[PDB]
Amino acid sequence: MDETVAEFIKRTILKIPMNELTTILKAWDFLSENQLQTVNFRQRKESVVQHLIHLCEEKRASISDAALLDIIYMQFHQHQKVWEVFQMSKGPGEDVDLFDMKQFKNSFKKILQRA
Amino acid sequence: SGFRKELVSRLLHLHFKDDKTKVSGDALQLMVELLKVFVVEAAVRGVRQAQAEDALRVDVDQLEKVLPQLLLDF
Amino acid sequence: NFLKKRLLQQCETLKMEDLTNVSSLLNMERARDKANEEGLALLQEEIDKM
Amino acid sequence: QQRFSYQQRLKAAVHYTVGCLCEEVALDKEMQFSKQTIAAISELTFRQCENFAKDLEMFARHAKRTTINTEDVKLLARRSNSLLKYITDKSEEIAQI
Amino acid sequence: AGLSHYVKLFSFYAKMPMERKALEMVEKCLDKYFQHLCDDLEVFAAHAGRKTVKPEDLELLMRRQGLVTDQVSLHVLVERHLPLEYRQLLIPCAYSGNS
Amino acid sequence: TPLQKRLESVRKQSSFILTPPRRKIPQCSQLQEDVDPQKVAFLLHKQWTLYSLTPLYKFSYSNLKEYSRLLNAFIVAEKQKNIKVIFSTLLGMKGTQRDPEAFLVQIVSREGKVLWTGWFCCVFGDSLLETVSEDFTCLPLFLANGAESNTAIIGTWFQKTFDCYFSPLAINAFNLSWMAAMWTACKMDHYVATTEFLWSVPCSPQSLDISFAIHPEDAKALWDSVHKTPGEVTQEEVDLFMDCLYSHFHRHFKIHLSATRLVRVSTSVASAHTDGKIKILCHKYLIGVLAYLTELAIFQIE
Amino acid sequence: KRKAPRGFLKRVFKRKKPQLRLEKSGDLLVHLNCLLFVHRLAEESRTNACASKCRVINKEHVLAAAKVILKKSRG
DNA sequence: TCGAGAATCCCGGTGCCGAGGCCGC
DNA sequence: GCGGCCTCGGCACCGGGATTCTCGA
């Protein structure tokens, strides 16, 4: 329900194949159990990619969760977009006693939006 | 004020494709009214799509996006 | 008449709405860029101050 | 020449009276009509006055008539509901005159 | 019926596959098209002062719809879309007995 | 003479009498006469999918407009089952003066978006000219590059109107190794691309492919190691170049590359695949690369 | 499709408005009006489809088509 | 000596035709 | 569960980003 967000959701919803439509749309949580019955997932591609995005127009979809849709799409399609492997290395000392997922999310977003 | 009589005679009669058709003052002042509300309606539609975009100015492009429904409607 | 031959004098010899509008948009963009340099450069001054 | 002196002089008259209308309708919604905005709305009034003249003549031709009466402009007011309602009361006010 | 005729003709007029859910809404579009037309023929025939709706009563209406012009008159518009045995009724042919 | 000459040619070819074609290193082919610089330069870095084209019956290089219309009206009709077809004689894609002038077939779509750009050329193909009658204008090579669907439509049109038949030219790994050797033997400068040999091992369950990409100057110095007779490259010299590749690959990875098959040999002169999508023409040696390609097309036709 | 229903248009013109005197072939003119109205619908809906680059006409393109053409086709 | 501009090696991010699925007879 | 229908997807050809390396502050 925004620029580069609604059509972004459209472009990531025609990406996902018809078989695993339920699997990815259930995990990203915007479509609750009641919302799944409204759209007939078995009918057509352009039908579902138009009714689902409307179901986010009423749900006022934001890029924060539109990107989560792309994440869940790739979690089942990780066998594309060839992956580099980065290897971190701490020096001498104790391990990371504080990898708080909240703190790591903060310490990553803050540093990335710093530059 | 309005779009006066000797001007409404002249403007309409310019687009008249023949010389023998006249429009009476009873209909002339109503023609004044209909194009006065042409200005009023085009202006209100433009400023309405302006609050729809929340502007303090009526720009060039607002009028261009209002013609597809202005000429269609009026 | 003189304005039509002014046409015939300039156009014969020889965007703008995009100019004005896009120039105002890009001026806001350069304000945003000055904000970007204020933020990035100052946070670089703090990072290299560290 | 004559076509230019005709339509440019009425373009001037349309701009002048439509600018009076611009000052008269700019005071309602506290708005200002820029120079190109007035220049545009004046030429749409001109261009669609061409449309009204095209319509109204064949409107009289439609009733096997040469003169233009109030039912012809009522058919010009037939186009839209909101100005049907607006022009109905303004037309009974016409008949008051 | 006839609305189903027009939605099927829509298929060969849009040259492109659509949805049935689109067709019952274009059915409401045709219903409102008549809801504007048959009272537009009403008011235009009343404008001419005639109880019936003569062919010129609709030529003016189609002038209103911008489809009749000084370039494209009424009869030429019949050439391009109506079949021959139907335009034989509308546009006057000539046998010294013009229809 | 009109047919029996071709029968004797078929006899000679099938005899297989001591074939090793000691080939002259592709000589720098200074662009002959017209050779429209814009057209030829557009025709170089395009991946031509080779075909073998039997001689065209009743063809003439005057009725190009009639064939253009006859094929344009056929292609858009295959869409009924926006497109312009421009037959264009190339005027210079010929080895000897007696060869038929190469001519193009371009599916031009509004603007000059050339969808297909066919290309029939007969350069240094005088093993076919002297065996076919005058009525046939023989162009053994056909060059696609457009989608396979449009090629399999213009080919049908050509079969219908000219009695010419398109076998998809498949360069076997032997001919592929040959051309991979004579292209690192050339006298070029400023090597555009590395000399890559895309091998493809014959494993039944899996389909591992190898890209033995050599530095183009390093392969030239490796070729000079196995190059002894100048002017002409022999089969033994080509095999020794290929075996120096083999003994630099089995040396490193202990897998016998000679037990695999070439599928693509990219070179600074011209890339060359096997399955048909073969000839990229990076440099302007294309009258020599096309000479080899036409000589190979004769092999398939004759 | 190569047809134009004589009966259906007359039945519609009588059902919707009970008081008219549509002429011998006036319903044929009504069919021409609807034919051209649906022409405009098809072409401007093709434009609507290219607006969102949808390769199938859907509800969201027809509803946008209606408010333009149906209003335009009003006399 | 060094800083911005252009070209081009390295690999995408795209275009587009066979394969698999799927709904009347 | 098949008949002419349709939709993903490997392969591959064409379009910008950063490294070369030449020139200006």
The CA distance from F240 to F20, in Å, is 14
- Nearest chain D residue to B55 by CA distance is D31
The CA distance from E47 to D58, in Å, is 11
Beta strands in chain G (DSSP E): 21-22
Number of domains comprising chain G? 1
Chain B touching partners, 3 or more CB pairs below 8 A: C, D, G
From which experimental method does this structure derive?
cryo-EM
Q: For H15, which residue's CA is nearest its C1'?
A: F147
Residues B49 and B28 occupy one common structural domain: no
CB E9 within 8 A of CB G38: yes
**Is C48 near chain B, with CB under 8 Å?**
no
Residues B47 and B74 occupy one common structural domain: yes
**Is D53 near chain B, with CB under 8 Å?**
yes
Query: Strand H neighbours with CB under 7 A?
Result: A 82; F 147-150, 192-194
Please, which residues 27-46 of chain B have a Cβ atom closer than 8 Å to chain D? 27, 29-31, 33-44, 46
CA torsion G65-A3-A69-A48 (nearest 10°) is 0
Provide the token pair at F300.
Answer: 């398939």
The CA distance from E50 to F290, in Å, is 82
**G26-52 vs E2-14: helix axis angle to the nearest 10?**
50
Nucleotides of I under 7 A from a protein CB: 6-10, 12-14
How is residue F259 annotated by DSSP?
Answer: G
CB D13 within 8 A of CB B7: yes
The CA distance from A94 to B67, in Å, is 71
Q: Is residue G1 part of a domain?
A: no
Q: What residue has token string 């017209």?
A: F34
Please, which residues 3-32 of chain B have a Cβ atom closer than 8 Å to chain D? 3-4, 7, 10-12, 14-18, 20-24, 26-27, 29-31
* The nucleotide closest to F149 (CA, C1' atoms): H17
Residues B74 and B40 occupy one common structural domain: yes
Residues B49 and B60 occupy one common structural domain: yes
Phi, psi of F200 (to 5 degrees): -155, 105
Report the candidate in F158, F152, F131, F71 with the shortest Cα–Cα distance to residue F298: F131
Residues of chain G contacting residue A50, judged by C-beta atoms under 8 Å apart: 54, 58-60
Report the candidate in F181, F176, F216 with the shortest Cα–Cα distance to residue F23: F181
- Nearest chain G residue to E43 by CA distance is G75
Judged by 3 or more CB pairs under 8 A, whether G touches A is yes
Strand partners, F166: F53
Query: D50 to each of B13, B45, D21, F206, how far by Cα in Å?
Result: 10, 21, 20, 76
Report the candidate in D44, D74, D80 with the shortest Cα–Cα distance to residue D59: D74
Residues of chain D contacting residue E64, judged by C-beta atoms under 8 Å apart: 55
Residues of chain G contacting residue E80, judged by C-beta atoms under 8 Å apart: none
Cβ atoms within 10 Å, residue F30: 8
What residue type is A90 in one-letter code?
Answer: K
The CA distance from D50 to E34, in Å, is 28
- Nearest chain C residue to A113 by CA distance is C40
Burial B33-72 (b: 16+ CB within 10 A, else e): bbbbbbbbbbbebbbebbeeeeeeebbeebbeebbeebeb
Domain of residue G50, CATH code: 1.10.20.10
Provide the token pair at B72.
Answer: 């269609």
CB E2 within 8 A of CB G9: yes
Provide the token pair at B48.
Answer: 């309405």
Q: Which CATH number is D2-96 given? A: 1.10.20.10
Declared resolution, Å:
3.7
The CA distance from E57 to E65, in Å, is 13
Beta strand pairing status for G21-22 and E52-53?
parallel
- Mutation site for D-interface testing, chosen from B23, B29, B32, B72 by largest number of D Cβ within 10 Å: B23
Residue D95 burial (C-beta neighbours within 10 Å; 0-12, 13-18, 19+): exposed
E7-E12-E15 Cα angle (round to 5)? 115
Report the candidate in E30, B71, B63 with the shortest Cα–Cα distance to residue D79: B71
Residues B21 and B43 occupy one common structural domain: no
The CA distance from A66 to C40, in Å, is 28
Number of domains comprising chain B? 2
CA torsion G11-G17-G18-G22 (nearest 10°) is -70
Query: Which domain does G46 fall in, by range?
Result: 6-73
Query: Which domain does B40 fall in, by range?
Result: 33-74
Beta strand pairing status for F118-121 and F141-143?
antiparallel
Q: What residue has token string 């609709």?
A: E58
Smallest CA–CA distance, residue E19 to chain D, in Å, is: 31
Residues of chain A contacting residue C40, judged by C-beta atoms under 8 Å apart: 114-115
The CA distance from D38 to D44, in Å, is 10
Report the candidate in F175, F149, F148, F144 with the shortest Cα–Cα distance to residue F274: F175
- The full set of domain ranges for chain D reads 2-96
D66-D67-D68 Cα angle (round to 5)? 125
The CA distance from B45 to B63, in Å, is 9
Which residue among E43, E49, E56 places its CB closest to the CB of D78?
A: E43
Provide the token pair at C46.
Answer: 């703090």
> Which own/partner contact pairs does F199-206 have at CB distance under 8 Å and 24+ positions apart?
F199/F257, F199/F260, F199/F261, F199/F262, F199/F263, F200/F260, F200/F261, F200/F262, F200/F263, F201/F255, F201/F259, F201/F260, F202/F259, F202/F260, F202/F261
